[PDB]
Amino acid sequence: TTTLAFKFRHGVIVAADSRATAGAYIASQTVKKVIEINPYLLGTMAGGAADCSFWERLLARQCRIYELRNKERISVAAASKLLANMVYQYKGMGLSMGTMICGWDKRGPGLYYVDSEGNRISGATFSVGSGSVYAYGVMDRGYSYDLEVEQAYDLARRAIYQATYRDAYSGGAVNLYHVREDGWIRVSSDNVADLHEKYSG
Amino acid sequence: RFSPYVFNGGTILAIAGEDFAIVASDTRLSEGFSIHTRDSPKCYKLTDKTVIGCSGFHGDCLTLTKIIEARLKMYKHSNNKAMTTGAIAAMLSTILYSRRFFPYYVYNIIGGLDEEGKGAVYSFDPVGSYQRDSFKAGGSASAMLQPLLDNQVGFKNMQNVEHVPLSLDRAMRLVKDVFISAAERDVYTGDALRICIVTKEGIREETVSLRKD
Amino acid sequence: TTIMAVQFDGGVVLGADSRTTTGSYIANRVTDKLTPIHDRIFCCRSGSAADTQAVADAVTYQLGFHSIELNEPPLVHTAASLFKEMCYRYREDLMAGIIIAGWDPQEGGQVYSVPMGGMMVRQSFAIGGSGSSYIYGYVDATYREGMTKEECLQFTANALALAMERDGSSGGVIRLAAIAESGVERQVLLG
Amino acid sequence: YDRGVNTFSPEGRLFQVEYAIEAIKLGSTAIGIQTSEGVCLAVEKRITSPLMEPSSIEKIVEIDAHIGCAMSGLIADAKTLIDKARVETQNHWFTYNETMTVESVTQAVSNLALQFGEEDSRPFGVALLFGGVDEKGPQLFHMDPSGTFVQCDARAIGSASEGAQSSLQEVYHKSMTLKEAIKSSLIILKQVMEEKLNATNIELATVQPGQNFHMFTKEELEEVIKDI
Amino acid sequence: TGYDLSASTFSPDGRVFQVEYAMKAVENSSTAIGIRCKDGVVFGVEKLVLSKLYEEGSNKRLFNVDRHVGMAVAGLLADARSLADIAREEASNFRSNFGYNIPLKHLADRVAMYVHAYTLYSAVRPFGCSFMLGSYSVNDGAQLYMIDPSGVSYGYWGCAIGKARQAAKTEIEKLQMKEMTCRDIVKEVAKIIYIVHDEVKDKAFELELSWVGELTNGRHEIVPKDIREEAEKYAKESLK
Amino acid sequence: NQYDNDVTVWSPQGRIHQIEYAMEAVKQGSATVGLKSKTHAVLVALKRAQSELAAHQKKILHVDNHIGISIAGLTADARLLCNFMRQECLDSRFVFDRPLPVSRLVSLIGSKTQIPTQRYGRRPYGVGLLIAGYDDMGPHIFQTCPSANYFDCRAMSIGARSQSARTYLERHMSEFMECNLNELVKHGLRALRETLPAEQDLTTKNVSIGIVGKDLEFTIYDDDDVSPFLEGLEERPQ
Amino acid sequence: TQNPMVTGTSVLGVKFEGGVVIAADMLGSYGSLARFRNISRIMRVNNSTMLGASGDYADFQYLKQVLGQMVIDEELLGDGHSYSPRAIHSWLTRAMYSRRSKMNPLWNTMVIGGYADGESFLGYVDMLGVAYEAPSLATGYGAYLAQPLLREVLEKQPVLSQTEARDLVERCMRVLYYRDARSYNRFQIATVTEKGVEIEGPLSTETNWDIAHMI
């Protein structure tokens, strides 16, 4: 499990792997770990399959009612706060949730990080997962706020590949989304074995 | 002291075809080092286009089956129509999460036809996360069936082989071959093989015997 | 603790030791282990002392209230049902060894056994308590169908004294009781 | 015996809900027409003041992204019914991954309007028109304070309700088109209202199968009125 | 009279008319009689056919409370159905708490106190039913009880409930019921029904006879007088 | 007139008028006729239009695979008893794994409607339920009433001007036990055509026919499949 | 129930041509002490179905109390209906599953035999709510001992007469006396037919001890 997210001048980049295991047994290789909440919001899956699947679907149930009652989209800081209060009521009962919230706002970009323990922080760069610590170093060596769009696509695609190389619980495919001002857009989805012929060559 | 869980064995197989779906399971019910019966299939015809399989703890399998069959009637008289394949997988995920802190010990696979007439297989976990796949194998012999179907159906790790879609007749003999090889090395598998075929013309059934040891 | 109950043609015969102990120290040296509920129905108790005294007060409250409404003497099987409805319900909370015996006008002498579990069964003779395990081989080689009253008083006196031979939860003094249609004869045996 | 929801008449009846039907009559008119191309919908505003802000008066609300609404009668009870009608379509998508059909929306709505004295309050004072395009095509339904639910092909309620129905039954047929039914609807409106029909007295709302958006017309309404 | 609205109010002379009004609602129902011999209790109900579409055994007034207890209700039929379910539920708790069959002397006390509770509050009304209770045992013999809408409950040898309450008990008391057997009683019950207005100003009727005693070994069931039809053969000979 | 206000208040004649008034709400609804053979029980209802182009209000509604009911009276009390009806049918499927006997389900309704006919705070249910079903001993035709009495019968018609339908059923009830569905259905809908004013005819758009059979699940036919039933009929003798 | 005080032992059951036969012994052991030598462990339900049980006996008197009430509650209606043997098997499973969900289970293992509509019925009920059907059943140590003798004959011959079935049970009840430490040499045999439920008296076995003279 390895996800990352970083914002820059032209929006937010979201990338993740697709491998979900069960002990030492790989269950699948085509797990979509970036949950499409809205046409203007995105959420990740990191730690616990049904825990990140249920509560973000319940958050998407809540943000639609907020749009109908007020004739306006929800802000990014609002949705991350509503998710933090729902999980905090089950503190200590044994949940696992480490997702991220992305989306464009009236204040510009938006990037928050929500734990099951109760940590709600903002920031510019994040990397969540078991192989997350392999992704901080290769990202920060190439990170800049004024990167190009095609340059930012190659940075996140490189960083997932180096994480799936060293980690054993990470592999499959590399998904890649791009959050624009109007809404998010799916970039691509590449296999790791196809990148190995490209990068090592 | 009292313990509320026990393992019963079982093996469930599903393959999503182009315009069909095949659900297969064994009929051996066991516990510990004893055989309760040799006739207990895991197939359950929910609708005319959807068959569910339930493995794991057998007491939860009898309970969870009757809860779903009640809510099929509760959907219909409230909506004047039957559920789809994807609607059942969305409903089942809420039922499995509803007992999050006392979970069902049941592995679930739903196979059937969508509204376009194509195959669809949904796999599950005992807490309620799901995804749509082309083929899954759940149960005690799950590790002995997934690498072989990656070779034959998914064509993984193969070179210079075209990707022909799996026909109905070729898919029947692939199901009949994997359960013979699985019953040799696994002890929780044998005594029969119930196969359900879901097409646009109804649901067919077929029973193939296995070794009885 | 050792309790004893034998029915005969007329009625029943009860008997018990005293020796209420704690650890290895005798707290109470002489003890009424048998308790009146109605004029014809007794029970002899075993297990925890504070548990069995609380149950015997509630059954006497319920059965004593119940017979005044019917204007009839109660049944012995009715009284044994009331101990079952409390011991089975409040199990994992009580340790009771109740044996119910007494004469009834409809059926004569009856003996019921309610162990620590909560089941109920009618028997010809019944033993119970901690010291009852030592006389189980004596009580069935000596019992004979068709005894008189004076044989049963002789029977339970020798039967208790073997459990009351030395065994640390038993001994003390013998309290006997005979219930028939005429009355209730209670006596204390020593020497 | 005519002041209680817990009391019958010698003939029928209520005598309480019958008075609730009368509360619709002092509302504003509203016309909805079902057509095979989609469902159009019209209403009259009755703006009182120029300082009164016009878009704060709602008559068409968006229940869901393929279902519109219309109302008359008491405004205070209407906002209660719109609230759960948005929630019940939202709870259904949460547990089924699908859009609730237009008929089964009003099943959830009518289950609470028949709870006024049937718990263990008063009935409501508002009639509703529900238009939408579900998997059975375009639909148009109608309810009442008495919970009596029915499907209509073309319905007009509120004030001028009966006078609209006689003219509306004249021009309706099965083979209408959507652009024909829109201009046919507001010929009826300018014959039943007292002010001169302009771009500020009325508002429109349509729904189409492939155009599930746009349950409103924003000053394309000026083009329809100028070609009457 | 105005001072007769609630059941919790007294008249200026000291009686409750809401109990008095519900008593003569039982008066408009058809006649149901009860009688006991020395070794059993025999019921009997005059029951009239509504028009023609009745299907020969519907909505009966001979209930079955316990293994040995049944009812012979008359009055508002729907109110008697809810009252019969109380007696079914009351006899079940006596089994589960004491382990033997309910005595009829104790059963009629539990029911009559329940009827009494609906004659005290202004929220509820008194019942509009009166009924019979018959049972048989080997330690108690046969008993026969009687419960009014007010709640007064005590024992009879014979009774009648309906229009002809007085007109039936005139000819009940000229029977030597202390020594007859309850097979000879069955042919004698049927003539008591057919004397007093079976179909004279009414349209039609059908006789029902319930049956409990020593020959049934304590069971309560309907008569086998569909077998040999002897009740109507012996009672219709009393035309002159 | 002062006694004519509440359910609790008795009369000096001994008749509670509020129960007597809920019978009058049954006569407001349209007529419906149910009957049965040895093997097949068919109930036929009559739709009523609201306007000239609205859909007709449905009467017969499915309950279980062996139980279907008709309706006459308040639509508020209609769906309130239906939700109580469907809950009890699936509890026996969930617990006992058998279908309910029809005769003991209706006894639950008489216990259900008895409380709001005695305690203050809730009116009686104005409703006219006809019930057809299959237990292990064949078909049944049941009716209820707001006085909480339920009547077993072999033929019944309730609703507006349903007395003329009862006269047709009494002089043809000897023929009902033997004939099969091709005429047993059109024995029933010859009884509806006397509950009509003598100038209009029973068309295809205003009638519903529901059939449950010994080997047949309860099926509702309306507006398209009534045409194989309305064929082969005579007119009224006018 | 967390601690079973007074327990039973193995209960057998097998179908034949037009009926189901069920046998069990009459022992009320407490741990290793056989405290109660004379109890009945087979309950006769009304006319077609029939119940024998293992596990805790105080819990069995509770289910004897509840099932005895429900049969009376339907017979007093007199509507011509009764509980099928499959409906008792459905109700009893939901009773056991709802009881273990509160973490306070009933320590039992129950075998339901019934014959209705010309069809035999033989159902199993576990403490944990595990239920199935089988042509032959055995509980406790009998599932290790008498169960291979049951399945051996039923595969070489699928149907059995009444005399072939009753003789086969006495062979298996003879075996359990030799090697079960909680057995008892006095048992009773219950059998359903089209004529109804019939329970035989306290029968005994016939043992062999000729290998004792060997070394």
Swiss-Prot record, chain B:
<keyword id="KW-0945">Host-virus interaction</keyword>
<dbReference type="GO" id="GO:0005829">
    <property type="term" value="C:cytosol"/>
</dbReference>
<feature type="modified residue" description="N6-acetyllysine">
    <location>
        <position position="176"/>
    </location>
</feature>
<dbReference type="GO" id="GO:0005634">
    <property type="term" value="C:nucleus"/>
</dbReference>
<protein>
    <recommendedName>
        <fullName>Proteasome subunit beta type-1</fullName>
    </recommendedName>
</protein>
<dbReference type="GO" id="GO:0005839">
    <property type="term" value="C:proteasome core complex"/>
</dbReference>
<comment type="function">
    <text>Non-catalytic component of the 20S core proteasome complex involved in the proteolytic degradation of most intracellular proteins. This complex plays numerous essential roles within the cell by associating with different regulatory particles. Associated with two 19S regulatory particles, forms the 26S proteasome and thus participates in the ATP-dependent degradation of ubiquitinated proteins.</text>
</comment>
<dbReference type="GO" id="GO:0034774">
    <property type="term" value="C:secretory granule lumen"/>
</dbReference>
<keyword id="KW-0539">Nucleus</keyword>
<feature type="modified residue" description="Phosphoserine">
    <location>
        <position position="134"/>
    </location>
</feature>
<dbReference type="Pfam" id="PF00227">
    <property type="entry name" value="Proteasome"/>
</dbReference>
<feature type="modified residue" description="Phosphoserine">
    <location>
        <position position="34"/>
    </location>
</feature>
UniProtKB/Swiss-Prot annotation, chain C:
<feature type="active site" description="Nucleophile">
    <location>
        <position position="1"/>
    </location>
</feature>
<keyword id="KW-0378">Hydrolase</keyword>
<dbReference type="GO" id="GO:0043161">
    <property type="term" value="P:proteasome-mediated ubiquitin-dependent protein catabolic process"/>
</dbReference>
<dbReference type="GO" id="GO:0000502">
    <property type="term" value="C:proteasome complex"/>
</dbReference>
<keyword id="KW-0007">Acetylation</keyword>
<keyword id="KW-0963">Cytoplasm</keyword>
<dbReference type="GO" id="GO:0005829">
    <property type="term" value="C:cytosol"/>
</dbReference>
<keyword id="KW-0945">Host-virus interaction</keyword>
<keyword id="KW-0865">Zymogen</keyword>
<dbReference type="GO" id="GO:0019774">
    <property type="term" value="C:proteasome core complex, beta-subunit complex"/>
</dbReference>
<feature type="modified residue" description="Phosphothreonine">
    <location>
        <position position="35"/>
    </location>
</feature>
<dbReference type="GO" id="GO:0005737">
    <property type="term" value="C:cytoplasm"/>
</dbReference>
From Swiss-Prot, chain D:
<feature type="modified residue" description="Phosphoserine">
    <location>
        <position position="49"/>
    </location>
</feature>
<dbReference type="InterPro" id="IPR029055">
    <property type="entry name" value="Ntn_hydrolases_N"/>
</dbReference>
<feature type="modified residue" description="Phosphoserine">
    <location>
        <position position="9"/>
    </location>
</feature>
<dbReference type="GO" id="GO:0005829">
    <property type="term" value="C:cytosol"/>
</dbReference>
<dbReference type="InterPro" id="IPR033812">
    <property type="entry name" value="Proteasome_alpha_type_5"/>
</dbReference>
<dbReference type="GO" id="GO:0000502">
    <property type="term" value="C:proteasome complex"/>
</dbReference>
<keyword id="KW-0007">Acetylation</keyword>
<keyword id="KW-0539">Nucleus</keyword>
<dbReference type="Pfam" id="PF00227">
    <property type="entry name" value="Proteasome"/>
</dbReference>
<dbReference type="GO" id="GO:0034774">
    <property type="term" value="C:secretory granule lumen"/>
</dbReference>
<dbReference type="GO" id="GO:1904813">
    <property type="term" value="C:ficolin-1-rich granule lumen"/>
</dbReference>
<dbReference type="InterPro" id="IPR023332">
    <property type="entry name" value="Proteasome_alpha-type"/>
</dbReference>
UniProtKB/Swiss-Prot annotation, chain F:
<dbReference type="InterPro" id="IPR029055">
    <property type="entry name" value="Ntn_hydrolases_N"/>
</dbReference>
<comment type="subunit">
    <text>The 26S proteasome consists of a 20S proteasome core and two 19S regulatory subunits. The 20S proteasome core is a barrel-shaped complex made of 28 subunits that are arranged in four stacked rings. The two outer rings are each formed by seven alpha subunits, and the two inner rings are formed by seven beta subunits. The proteolytic activity is exerted by three beta-subunits PSMB5, PSMB6 and PSMB7. Interacts with NOTCH3. Interacts with ZFAND1.</text>
</comment>
<feature type="cross-link" description="Glycyl lysine isopeptide (Lys-Gly) (interchain with G-Cter in ubiquitin)">
    <location>
        <position position="112"/>
    </location>
</feature>
<keyword id="KW-0647">Proteasome</keyword>
<keyword id="KW-0539">Nucleus</keyword>
<dbReference type="GO" id="GO:0043161">
    <property type="term" value="P:proteasome-mediated ubiquitin-dependent protein catabolic process"/>
</dbReference>
<dbReference type="InterPro" id="IPR050115">
    <property type="entry name" value="Proteasome_alpha"/>
</dbReference>
<dbReference type="GO" id="GO:0002376">
    <property type="term" value="P:immune system process"/>
</dbReference>
<keyword id="KW-1017">Isopeptide bond</keyword>
<protein>
    <recommendedName>
        <fullName>Proteasome subunit alpha type-1</fullName>
    </recommendedName>
</protein>
<dbReference type="GO" id="GO:0001530">
    <property type="term" value="F:lipopolysaccharide binding"/>
</dbReference>
<dbReference type="GO" id="GO:0005829">
    <property type="term" value="C:cytosol"/>
</dbReference>
